[PDB]
Design a protein around this motif. Structure first.
Motif, PDB file in Angstrom:
ATOM      1  N   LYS A 131       2.240   1.245  -2.348  1.00 36.97           N
ATOM      2  CA  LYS A 131       1.283   1.792  -1.394  1.00 36.97           C
ATOM      3  C   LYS A 131       1.976   2.738  -0.419  1.00 36.97           C
ATOM      4  CE  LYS A 131      -1.095  -1.630   0.430  1.00 36.97           C
ATOM      5  NZ  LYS A 131       0.058  -2.051   1.274  1.00 36.97           N
ATOM      6  N   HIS A 132       1.592   4.010  -0.457  1.00 35.63           N
ATOM      7  CA  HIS A 132       2.186   5.012   0.422  1.00 35.63           C
ATOM      8  C   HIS A 132       1.131   5.997   0.922  1.00 35.63           C
ATOM      9  CE1 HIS A 132       4.595   8.962   0.827  1.00 35.63           C
ATOM     10  NE2 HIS A 132       4.696   8.291   1.959  1.00 35.63           N
ATOM     11  N   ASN A 133       1.310   6.467   2.153  1.00 38.53           N
ATOM     12  CA  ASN A 133       0.383   7.419   2.755  1.00 38.53           C
ATOM     13  C   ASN A 133      -1.046   6.880   2.750  1.00 38.53           C
ATOM     14  OD1 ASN A 133      -0.692   9.744   3.870  1.00 38.53           O
ATOM     15  ND2 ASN A 133      -0.753  10.856   1.920  1.00 38.53           N
ATOM     16  N   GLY A 134      -1.179   5.559   2.685  1.00 37.97           N
ATOM     17  CA  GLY A 134      -2.496   4.947   2.677  1.00 37.97           C
ATOM     18  C   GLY A 134      -3.135   4.930   1.300  1.00 37.97           C
ATOM     19  N   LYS A 135      -2.490   5.573   0.330  1.00 38.05           N
ATOM     20  CA  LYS A 135      -3.011   5.623  -1.029  1.00 38.05           C
ATOM     21  C   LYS A 135      -2.167   4.762  -1.963  1.00 38.05           C
ATOM     22  CE  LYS A 135      -4.124  10.377   0.140  1.00 38.05           C
ATOM     23  NZ  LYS A 135      -4.299  11.679  -0.559  1.00 38.05           N
ATOM     24  N   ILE A 136      -2.792   3.744  -2.545  1.00 44.06           N
ATOM     25  CA  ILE A 136      -2.098   2.842  -3.457  1.00 44.06           C
ATOM     26  C   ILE A 136      -1.643   3.574  -4.716  1.00 44.06           C
ATOM     27  CG2 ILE A 136      -2.195   0.643  -4.674  1.00 44.06           C
ATOM     28  CD1 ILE A 136      -5.060   0.646  -2.769  1.00 44.06           C
ATOM     29  N   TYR A 137      -0.331   3.723  -4.864  1.00 46.16           N
ATOM     30  CA  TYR A 137       0.237   4.400  -6.024  1.00 46.16           C
ATOM     31  C   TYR A 137       0.529   3.403  -7.139  1.00 46.16           C
ATOM     32  CZ  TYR A 137       0.828   9.025  -3.945  1.00 46.16           C
ATOM     33  OH  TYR A 137       0.606  10.270  -3.402  1.00 46.16           O
ATOM     34  N   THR A 138      -0.226   3.499  -8.228  1.00 47.56           N
ATOM     35  CA  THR A 138      -0.047   2.602  -9.363  1.00 47.56           C
ATOM     36  C   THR A 138       0.031   3.384 -10.670  1.00 47.56           C
ATOM     37  OG1 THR A 138      -1.172   0.886 -10.656  1.00 47.56           O
ATOM     38  CG2 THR A 138      -2.560   2.219  -9.279  1.00 47.56           C
ATOM     39  N   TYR A 139       0.797   2.860 -11.621  1.00 45.36           N
ATOM     40  CA  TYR A 139       0.956   3.508 -12.917  1.00 45.36           C
ATOM     41  C   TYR A 139      -0.283   3.309 -13.781  1.00 45.36           C
ATOM     42  CZ  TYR A 139       5.896   4.548 -12.173  1.00 45.36           C
ATOM     43  OH  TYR A 139       7.084   5.057 -11.702  1.00 45.36           O
ATOM     44  N   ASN A 140      -0.788   4.402 -14.343  1.00 43.12           N
ATOM     45  CA  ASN A 140      -1.971   4.348 -15.193  1.00 43.12           C
ATOM     46  C   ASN A 140      -1.661   4.888 -16.584  1.00 43.12           C
ATOM     47  OD1 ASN A 140      -4.714   4.043 -13.164  1.00 43.12           O
ATOM     48  ND2 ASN A 140      -2.741   4.590 -12.247  1.00 43.12           N
TER      49      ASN A 140
END
Length: 160
Positions: A105-114
């Motif tokens: 989770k960075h910059n308020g946006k959850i970064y996940t692998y898709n």
């Protein structure tokens, strides 16, 4: 890679990747605020003609639906709700061949692998009260700094 931290409920920091290395299908990790934002993470076993089993979501017993078209590839499914026992949208498709999961989770946006493993796609999910959300690991995971972003990607593709 930091260390295989066993499952437990706590406040997941930020700017750090959460490499979750499960052992089998089922639930892997979840996170919600219990106010107006829910986000769980479950895994589906290969070969599945669309089935609906009953599982405990955040303590509340509910029925979930899963599926699979591969023979030896897992299918991670991310669910999200707006209220307690309200909606239930299962999104966030991610196929893993070598068996490996990662979230951040960075910059308020959850970064996940898709996407698929050999062709993953790190997407993001706009959030607001993310900083006020707790998570509950259901298996062993590892801690990794965002600096090694490229490392995490290669790990999921064919890391282990």
């Amino acid at each position: 890679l930091d260390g295989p931290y066993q499952p437990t409920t706590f406040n997941p920091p930020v700017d750090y990747w959460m490499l979750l290395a499960p052992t089998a299908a089922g639930v892997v990790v979840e996170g919600t605020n219990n106010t107006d934002r829910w986000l769980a993470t479950i895994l589906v076993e290969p070969n599945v003609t669309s089935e609906t089993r009953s599982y405990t979501l955040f303590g509340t017993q509910e029925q979930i639906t899963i599926a699979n078209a591969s023979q030896t590839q897992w299918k991670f499914i991310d669910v999200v709700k707006t209220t307690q026992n309200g909606s239930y949208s299962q999104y966030g498709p991610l196929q893993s061949t070598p068996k490996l999961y990662a979230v951040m989770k960075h910059n308020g946006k959850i970064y996940t692998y898709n996407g698929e493993t050999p062709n993953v796609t790190t997407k993001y999910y706009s959030t607001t009260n993310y900083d006020s959300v707790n998570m509950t690991a259901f298996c062993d995971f590892y801690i990794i700094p965002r600096e090694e972003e490229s490392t995490c990607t290669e790990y999921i593709n064919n890391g282990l």
